[PDB]
Amino acid sequence: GTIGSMAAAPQVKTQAPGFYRMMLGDFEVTALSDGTVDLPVDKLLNQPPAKTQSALAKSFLKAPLETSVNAYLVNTGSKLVLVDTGAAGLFGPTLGKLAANLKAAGYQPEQVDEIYITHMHPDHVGGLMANEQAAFPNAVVRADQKDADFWLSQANLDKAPDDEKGFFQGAMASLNPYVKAGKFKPFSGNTDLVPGIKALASHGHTPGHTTYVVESKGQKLVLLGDLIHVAAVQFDDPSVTIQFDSDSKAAAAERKKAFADAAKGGYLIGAAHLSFPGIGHIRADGKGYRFVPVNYSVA
């Protein structure tokens, strides 16, 4: 090149901050990404790999599938509440981004009033704890009593097979600061939590798996937790379950109920493992369902 020609600019590669703002009536919703993680869904889904492979190909995907891990912040005006918290470092080095994305979204952990846990798998409770301390120093954490009593019981850890013991260890370590400080407040099934947010039992994926129903000024968003893991399989065929389910029959029943109710009601859903931000509508589509992601909107 000519004298002092500059080298070609290197690729930057880093992703944009993983948060997405959406108004819901008077409430401000911020989808928060914890990162993604590859899942061997051909092996984990409870059907023959060839059927999964064919379904993935139809959506231009292949296993291992990069799967989003999402949480949802809701500012109701009177309360700042966080639904799920990501994995922290419990599920590998690609997750644990929630804390940075919360900061990029303009909030600090000390501002969070209440945290609602859909279920105590590591990629939903790991974000509660850092350095054996509560990462959210003012928050009250709530989850179903059945989930608490299953995952936070020493007997169930000691009965669990070796490759499942970490789920109980991680849940206990994640909840312990709050339990010790008197800031873990269970509920039992369908419960009003704060004005505008209710717990709706959706048991199956875990014994206390809970859906959170957010409503303001007639605008409803139903946060489904882990009622779905693999959009490219489970919207066309909601009967396909996954090894991560504690009770796969109940999990399939709860997913079918939620999809049918959302199709009938025409309201928004948000789900922890739909491609970030994981927010959209559902319409019936023959024997299955079609997801309609929200339109990109800027205030």
Q: Which residues, 87 to 126, sit near Zn ion by CB under 5 A?
A: 121, 123
Contacts of 164 (CB under 8 A, 6+ apart): none
Interface mask (CB under 5 A) for Zn ion, residues 199-238, using x and -? Answer: ---------------------------x------------
Tell me: does residue 147 bind Zn ion (CB under 5 A).
Answer: no
- The CA distance from 240 to 45, in Å, is 7
The DSSP symbol for 64 reads: S
Look up residue 75 and give its two tokens.
């500012």
- The CA distance from 238 to 236, in Å, is 6
Tell me: does residue 183 bind Zn ion (CB under 5 A).
Answer: no
Measuring CA to CA, which residue among 237, 220, 233 is closest to residue 273?
233
Count of positions on this chain that bind Zn ion (CB under 5 A): 3
**Beta carbon nearer to Zn ion, 121 or 142:** 121
Peptide bond into 277 cis (omega under 30): yes
**Beta carbon nearer to Zn ion, 42 or 226:** 226
**Beta carbon nearer to Zn ion, 152 or 216:** 152
| Shortest distance (Å) from residue 116 CB to Zn ion | 15
| Shortest distance (Å) from residue 299 CB to Zn ion | 30
- The CA distance from 247 to 291, in Å, is 25
- The CA distance from 58 to 176, in Å, is 44
| Shortest distance (Å) from residue 242 CB to Zn ion | 9
Binding site for Zn ion (CB under 5 A): 121, 123, 226
